[PDB]
Protein backbone atom coordinates (compact mmCIF):
# COMPACT_ATOMS: atom_id res chain seq x y z
CA UNK A 1 0.00 0.00 0.00
CA UNK A 2 0.92 3.68 -0.11
CA UNK A 3 -0.31 6.88 1.55
CA UNK A 4 0.34 10.15 -0.27
CA UNK A 5 -0.13 13.73 0.91
CA UNK A 6 1.02 16.89 -0.85
CA UNK A 7 1.03 20.59 0.01
CA UNK A 8 1.72 23.13 -2.75
CA UNK A 9 1.83 26.74 -1.58
CA UNK A 10 1.35 29.25 -4.39
CA UNK A 11 1.13 32.96 -3.62
CA UNK A 12 1.94 36.26 -5.31
CA UNK A 13 1.18 39.86 -4.37
CA UNK A 14 2.01 43.51 -5.08
CA UNK A 15 2.23 43.60 -8.88
CA UNK A 16 2.15 47.37 -9.29
CA UNK A 17 2.57 47.55 -13.07
CA UNK A 18 2.68 44.79 -15.68
CA UNK A 19 1.43 44.62 -19.27
CA UNK A 20 0.98 40.83 -19.39
CA UNK A 21 0.40 38.93 -16.15
CA UNK A 22 -0.11 35.15 -16.11
CA UNK A 23 -0.13 33.49 -12.68
CA UNK A 24 -0.67 29.74 -12.98
CA UNK A 25 -0.47 27.37 -10.03
CA UNK A 26 0.27 24.33 -12.18
CA UNK A 27 0.48 23.77 -15.92
CA UNK A 28 0.34 20.66 -18.09
CA UNK A 29 -0.58 22.39 -21.36
CA UNK A 30 0.32 25.45 -23.42
CA UNK A 31 0.74 28.94 -21.97
CA UNK A 32 1.31 31.81 -24.40
CA UNK A 33 1.57 35.48 -23.49
CA UNK A 34 1.20 36.62 -27.09
CA UNK A 35 1.10 34.87 -30.46
CA UNK A 36 0.51 35.85 -34.07
CA UNK B 1 5.16 0.10 1.58
CA UNK B 2 6.06 3.78 1.29
CA UNK B 3 4.83 7.04 2.82
CA UNK B 4 5.45 10.23 0.84
CA UNK B 5 4.97 13.85 1.86
CA UNK B 6 6.09 16.94 -0.05
CA UNK B 7 6.09 20.68 0.65
CA UNK B 8 6.74 23.09 -2.23
CA UNK B 9 6.84 26.75 -1.23
CA UNK B 10 6.32 29.13 -4.15
CA UNK B 11 6.09 32.87 -3.54
CA UNK B 12 6.87 36.09 -5.39
CA UNK B 13 6.10 39.73 -4.61
CA UNK B 14 6.91 43.34 -5.49
CA UNK B 15 7.09 43.26 -9.29
CA UNK B 16 6.98 47.01 -9.87
CA UNK B 17 7.37 47.02 -13.66
CA UNK B 18 7.47 44.14 -16.14
CA UNK B 19 6.19 43.81 -19.70
CA UNK B 20 5.76 40.01 -19.66
CA UNK B 21 5.21 38.25 -16.33
CA UNK B 22 4.72 34.48 -16.11
CA UNK B 23 4.75 32.98 -12.61
CA UNK B 24 4.22 29.21 -12.73
CA UNK B 25 4.47 26.98 -9.67
CA UNK B 26 5.20 23.85 -11.69
CA UNK B 27 5.37 23.12 -15.40
CA UNK B 28 5.23 19.92 -17.43
CA UNK B 29 4.27 21.49 -20.76
CA UNK B 30 5.14 24.46 -22.97
CA UNK B 31 5.55 28.02 -21.69
CA UNK B 32 6.09 30.78 -24.25
CA UNK B 33 6.34 34.48 -23.51
CA UNK B 34 5.92 35.46 -27.16
CA UNK B 35 5.80 33.55 -30.44
CA UNK B 36 5.17 34.37 -34.09
CA UNK C 1 9.85 0.42 3.12
CA UNK C 2 10.78 4.07 2.64
CA UNK C 3 9.59 7.42 4.01
CA UNK C 4 10.21 10.50 1.86
CA UNK C 5 9.78 14.17 2.69
CA UNK C 6 10.90 17.14 0.62
CA UNK C 7 10.93 20.91 1.11
CA UNK C 8 11.57 23.17 -1.89
CA UNK C 9 11.72 26.87 -1.09
CA UNK C 10 11.19 29.10 -4.12
CA UNK C 11 10.99 32.87 -3.70
CA UNK C 12 11.78 35.98 -5.72
CA UNK C 13 11.04 39.66 -5.13
CA UNK C 14 11.87 43.22 -6.20
CA UNK C 15 12.02 42.94 -10.00
CA UNK C 16 11.93 46.65 -10.77
CA UNK C 17 12.29 46.47 -14.56
CA UNK C 18 12.35 43.46 -16.89
CA UNK C 19 11.03 42.95 -20.41
CA UNK C 20 10.56 39.16 -20.17
CA UNK C 21 10.04 37.59 -16.75
CA UNK C 22 9.52 33.84 -16.33
CA UNK C 23 9.57 32.52 -12.75
CA UNK C 24 9.01 28.75 -12.67
CA UNK C 25 9.26 26.69 -9.51
CA UNK C 26 9.95 23.44 -11.37
CA UNK C 27 10.09 22.52 -15.04
CA UNK C 28 9.90 19.22 -16.89
CA UNK C 29 8.92 20.62 -20.30
CA UNK C 30 9.79 23.47 -22.66
CA UNK C 31 10.24 27.08 -21.57
CA UNK C 32 10.78 29.70 -24.28
CA UNK C 33 11.07 33.44 -23.73
CA UNK C 34 10.62 34.23 -27.42
CA UNK C 35 10.46 32.15 -30.60
CA UNK C 36 9.80 32.79 -34.28
CA UNK D 1 14.39 0.64 4.52
CA UNK D 2 15.35 4.25 3.86
CA UNK D 3 14.21 7.67 5.08
CA UNK D 4 14.86 10.64 2.79
CA UNK D 5 14.46 14.36 3.45
CA UNK D 6 15.60 17.21 1.23
CA UNK D 7 15.69 21.00 1.55
CA UNK D 8 16.33 23.11 -1.56
CA UNK D 9 16.52 26.84 -0.92
CA UNK D 10 16.00 28.94 -4.06
CA UNK D 11 15.84 32.72 -3.81
CA UNK D 12 16.65 35.73 -5.98
CA UNK D 13 15.96 39.44 -5.55
CA UNK D 14 16.82 42.93 -6.80
CA UNK D 15 16.94 42.48 -10.58
CA UNK D 16 16.89 46.15 -11.52
CA UNK D 17 17.22 45.78 -15.30
CA UNK D 18 17.23 42.67 -17.48
CA UNK D 19 15.88 42.01 -20.98
CA UNK D 20 15.38 38.25 -20.55
CA UNK D 21 14.86 36.84 -17.06
CA UNK D 22 14.30 33.12 -16.46
CA UNK D 23 14.35 31.97 -12.83
CA UNK D 24 13.76 28.22 -12.57
CA UNK D 25 14.01 26.30 -9.32
CA UNK D 26 14.65 22.96 -11.02
CA UNK D 27 14.75 21.87 -14.65
CA UNK D 28 14.51 18.49 -16.35
CA UNK D 29 13.53 19.74 -19.81
CA UNK D 30 14.41 22.46 -22.31
CA UNK D 31 14.91 26.12 -21.39
CA UNK D 32 15.46 28.60 -24.22
CA UNK D 33 15.79 32.36 -23.85
CA UNK D 34 15.33 32.98 -27.57
CA UNK D 35 15.12 30.76 -30.65
CA UNK D 36 14.45 31.23 -34.35
CA UNK E 1 19.40 1.15 6.24
CA UNK E 2 20.35 4.72 5.37
CA UNK E 3 19.21 8.20 6.39
CA UNK E 4 19.83 11.03 3.93
CA UNK E 5 19.44 14.78 4.38
CA UNK E 6 20.56 17.51 1.99
CA UNK E 7 20.64 21.31 2.10
CA UNK E 8 21.26 23.23 -1.13
CA UNK E 9 21.45 27.00 -0.72
CA UNK E 10 20.90 28.91 -3.96
CA UNK E 11 20.74 32.70 -3.94
CA UNK E 12 21.53 35.58 -6.28
CA UNK E 13 20.84 39.30 -6.06
CA UNK E 14 21.68 42.72 -7.51
CA UNK E 15 21.79 42.05 -11.26
CA UNK E 16 21.73 45.66 -12.41
CA UNK E 17 22.03 45.08 -16.16
CA UNK E 18 22.04 41.85 -18.16
CA UNK E 19 20.67 40.99 -21.61
CA UNK E 20 20.18 37.25 -20.96
CA UNK E 21 19.68 36.05 -17.39
CA UNK E 22 19.13 32.37 -16.58
CA UNK E 23 19.21 31.43 -12.88
CA UNK E 24 18.62 27.70 -12.41
CA UNK E 25 18.89 25.96 -9.05
CA UNK E 26 19.53 22.54 -10.57
CA UNK E 27 19.62 21.24 -14.12
CA UNK E 28 19.37 17.77 -15.62
CA UNK E 29 18.37 18.82 -19.14
CA UNK E 30 19.24 21.39 -21.80
CA UNK E 31 19.73 25.10 -21.10
CA UNK E 32 20.26 27.41 -24.07
CA UNK E 33 20.59 31.18 -23.92
CA UNK E 34 20.11 31.59 -27.66
CA UNK E 35 19.89 29.20 -30.61
CA UNK E 36 19.19 29.45 -34.33
CA UNK F 1 2.00 18.52 -8.81
CA UNK F 2 2.79 14.84 -8.34
CA UNK F 3 2.36 11.65 -10.38
CA UNK F 4 2.19 8.37 -8.46
CA UNK F 5 2.26 4.80 -9.74
CA UNK F 6 2.56 1.63 -7.68
CA UNK F 7 2.93 -2.07 -8.47
CA UNK F 8 2.41 -4.62 -5.68
CA UNK F 9 2.99 -8.22 -6.71
CA UNK F 10 1.38 -10.75 -4.36
CA UNK F 11 1.50 -14.45 -5.17
CA UNK F 12 1.54 -17.76 -3.31
CA UNK F 13 1.23 -21.35 -4.49
CA UNK F 14 1.69 -25.00 -3.51
CA UNK F 15 0.31 -25.11 0.04
CA UNK F 16 0.06 -28.88 0.36
CA UNK F 17 -1.13 -29.08 3.97
CA UNK F 18 -2.11 -26.32 6.40
CA UNK F 19 -4.74 -26.16 9.14
CA UNK F 20 -5.21 -22.37 9.08
CA UNK F 21 -4.38 -20.46 5.90
CA UNK F 22 -4.83 -16.68 5.66
CA UNK F 23 -3.41 -15.01 2.54
CA UNK F 24 -4.03 -11.25 2.60
CA UNK F 25 -2.61 -8.88 0.01
CA UNK F 26 -2.84 -5.84 2.28
CA UNK F 27 -4.21 -5.30 5.77
CA UNK F 28 -5.24 -2.19 7.70
CA UNK F 29 -7.44 -3.93 10.28
CA UNK F 30 -7.48 -7.00 12.52
CA UNK F 31 -6.50 -10.49 11.36
CA UNK F 32 -6.99 -13.37 13.80
CA UNK F 33 -6.37 -17.03 13.07
CA UNK F 34 -8.22 -18.19 16.18
CA UNK F 35 -9.71 -16.44 19.21
CA UNK F 36 -11.75 -17.44 22.25
CA UNK G 1 7.19 18.30 -8.09
CA UNK G 2 7.89 14.62 -7.45
CA UNK G 3 7.42 11.35 -9.35
CA UNK G 4 7.16 8.16 -7.30
CA UNK G 5 7.15 4.54 -8.42
CA UNK G 6 7.38 1.46 -6.22
CA UNK G 7 7.67 -2.28 -6.85
CA UNK G 8 7.06 -4.69 -3.96
CA UNK G 9 7.58 -8.35 -4.82
CA UNK G 10 5.89 -10.73 -2.38
CA UNK G 11 5.94 -14.47 -3.03
CA UNK G 12 5.88 -17.69 -1.03
CA UNK G 13 5.51 -21.33 -2.06
CA UNK G 14 5.88 -24.94 -0.92
CA UNK G 15 4.46 -24.87 2.62
CA UNK G 16 4.12 -28.61 3.10
CA UNK G 17 2.90 -28.62 6.71
CA UNK G 18 1.95 -25.75 9.00
CA UNK G 19 -0.70 -25.41 11.70
CA UNK G 20 -1.08 -21.61 11.48
CA UNK G 21 -0.19 -19.86 8.22
CA UNK G 22 -0.54 -16.09 7.82
CA UNK G 23 0.94 -14.59 4.65
CA UNK G 24 0.40 -10.82 4.53
CA UNK G 25 1.90 -8.59 1.86
CA UNK G 26 1.72 -5.45 4.00
CA UNK G 27 0.33 -4.73 7.45
CA UNK G 28 -0.65 -1.52 9.22
CA UNK G 29 -2.91 -3.10 11.86
CA UNK G 30 -3.05 -6.06 14.23
CA UNK G 31 -2.13 -9.62 13.23
CA UNK G 32 -2.71 -12.38 15.79
CA UNK G 33 -2.16 -16.08 15.22
CA UNK G 34 -4.06 -17.06 18.36
CA UNK G 35 -5.55 -15.16 21.30
CA UNK G 36 -7.64 -15.97 24.35
CA UNK H 1 11.92 18.12 -7.39
CA UNK H 2 12.58 14.47 -6.59
CA UNK H 3 12.08 11.13 -8.34
CA UNK H 4 11.78 8.04 -6.15
CA UNK H 5 11.74 4.37 -7.12
CA UNK H 6 11.92 1.38 -4.78
CA UNK H 7 12.18 -2.38 -5.24
CA UNK H 8 11.53 -4.66 -2.26
CA UNK H 9 12.01 -8.36 -2.96
CA UNK H 10 10.29 -10.62 -0.42
CA UNK H 11 10.30 -14.38 -0.91
CA UNK H 12 10.20 -17.51 1.24
CA UNK H 13 9.79 -21.18 0.36
CA UNK H 14 10.12 -24.74 1.66
CA UNK H 15 8.69 -24.50 5.18
CA UNK H 16 8.31 -28.22 5.83
CA UNK H 17 7.07 -28.06 9.43
CA UNK H 18 6.15 -25.07 11.59
CA UNK H 19 3.49 -24.59 14.26
CA UNK H 20 3.15 -20.80 13.87
CA UNK H 21 4.08 -19.20 10.55
CA UNK H 22 3.76 -15.45 9.98
CA UNK H 23 5.27 -14.10 6.75
CA UNK H 24 4.78 -10.34 6.47
CA UNK H 25 6.30 -8.25 3.71
CA UNK H 26 6.15 -5.02 5.70
CA UNK H 27 4.75 -4.13 9.11
CA UNK H 28 3.80 -0.84 10.74
CA UNK H 29 1.51 -2.27 13.43
CA UNK H 30 1.34 -5.13 15.93
CA UNK H 31 2.22 -8.74 15.09
CA UNK H 32 1.61 -11.38 17.76
CA UNK H 33 2.11 -15.11 17.36
CA UNK H 34 0.19 -15.93 20.53
CA UNK H 35 -1.29 -13.88 23.38
CA UNK H 36 -3.40 -14.54 26.45
CA UNK I 1 16.83 17.80 -6.94
CA UNK I 2 17.43 14.19 -5.96
CA UNK I 3 16.88 10.77 -7.55
CA UNK I 4 16.52 7.79 -5.22
CA UNK I 5 16.43 4.08 -6.00
CA UNK I 6 16.55 1.22 -3.52
CA UNK I 7 16.75 -2.57 -3.79
CA UNK I 8 16.05 -4.69 -0.70
CA UNK I 9 16.48 -8.42 -1.22
CA UNK I 10 14.71 -10.53 1.41
CA UNK I 11 14.66 -14.31 1.11
CA UNK I 12 14.50 -17.33 3.40
CA UNK I 13 14.04 -21.03 2.71
CA UNK I 14 14.30 -24.53 4.18
CA UNK I 15 12.86 -24.09 7.68
CA UNK I 16 12.42 -27.77 8.50
CA UNK I 17 11.17 -27.42 12.08
CA UNK I 18 10.28 -24.31 14.09
CA UNK I 19 7.62 -23.66 16.73
CA UNK I 20 7.34 -19.89 16.15
CA UNK I 21 8.31 -18.47 12.75
CA UNK I 22 8.05 -14.74 12.00
CA UNK I 23 9.60 -13.58 8.72
CA UNK I 24 9.17 -9.83 8.25
CA UNK I 25 10.74 -7.90 5.40
CA UNK I 26 10.63 -4.57 7.23
CA UNK I 27 9.23 -3.49 10.59
CA UNK I 28 8.32 -0.12 12.05
CA UNK I 29 6.00 -1.38 14.79
CA UNK I 30 5.77 -4.11 17.42
CA UNK I 31 6.60 -7.76 16.77
CA UNK I 32 5.93 -10.26 19.57
CA UNK I 33 6.38 -14.01 19.35
CA UNK I 34 4.42 -14.65 22.55
CA UNK I 35 2.97 -12.44 25.28
CA UNK I 36 0.83 -12.92 28.37
CA UNK J 1 21.69 17.56 -6.30
CA UNK J 2 22.23 13.98 -5.15
CA UNK J 3 21.64 10.50 -6.59
CA UNK J 4 21.24 7.64 -4.12
CA UNK J 5 21.10 3.90 -4.74
CA UNK J 6 21.18 1.14 -2.13
CA UNK J 7 21.33 -2.66 -2.23
CA UNK J 8 20.59 -4.62 0.95
CA UNK J 9 20.97 -8.38 0.61
CA UNK J 10 19.17 -10.34 3.32
CA UNK J 11 19.07 -14.13 3.19
CA UNK J 12 18.87 -17.04 5.62
CA UNK J 13 18.36 -20.77 5.09
CA UNK J 14 18.57 -24.20 6.72
CA UNK J 15 17.12 -23.58 10.19
CA UNK J 16 16.64 -27.21 11.18
CA UNK J 17 15.37 -26.68 14.74
CA UNK J 18 14.52 -23.48 16.60
CA UNK J 19 11.86 -22.67 19.19
CA UNK J 20 11.63 -18.93 18.44
CA UNK J 21 12.63 -17.68 14.99
CA UNK J 22 12.43 -13.99 14.06
CA UNK J 23 14.00 -12.99 10.74
CA UNK J 24 13.62 -9.26 10.10
CA UNK J 25 15.22 -7.48 7.17
CA UNK J 26 15.15 -4.07 8.85
CA UNK J 27 13.75 -2.83 12.15
CA UNK J 28 12.88 0.63 13.45
CA UNK J 29 10.54 -0.48 16.24
CA UNK J 30 10.27 -3.09 18.99
CA UNK J 31 11.05 -6.78 18.51
CA UNK J 32 10.34 -9.14 21.41
CA UNK J 33 10.74 -12.90 21.37
CA UNK J 34 8.77 -13.36 24.59
CA UNK J 35 7.33 -11.02 27.21
CA UNK J 36 5.18 -11.33 30.31
Author numbering:
A (entry chain I), B (entry chain G), C (entry chain E), D (entry chain C), E (entry chain A), F (entry chain J), ...: 1 to 36
Paper excerpt:
The 3.3 Å map of DI1 was used to build an atomic model of the ordered core between D1 and V36.
Alzheimer’s disease is the most common form of dementia and is neuropathologically defined by the presence of extracellular plaques containing Aβ in the brain parenchyma and intraneuronal neurofibrillary tangles containing phosphorylated tau. Peptides between 37 and 43 residues in length are generated, with those of 40 (Aβ40) and 42 (Aβ42) residues in length being the most abundant. These Aβ monomers tend to aggregate into insoluble fibrils, the structure of which has been extensively studied in vitro by cryogenic-electron microscopy (cryo-EM) and solid-state nuclear magnetic resonance spectroscopy, revealing a spectrum of different polymorphs. Here, we determined the structures of nine ex vivo Aβ fibrils from six different mouse models by cryogenic-electron microscopy.
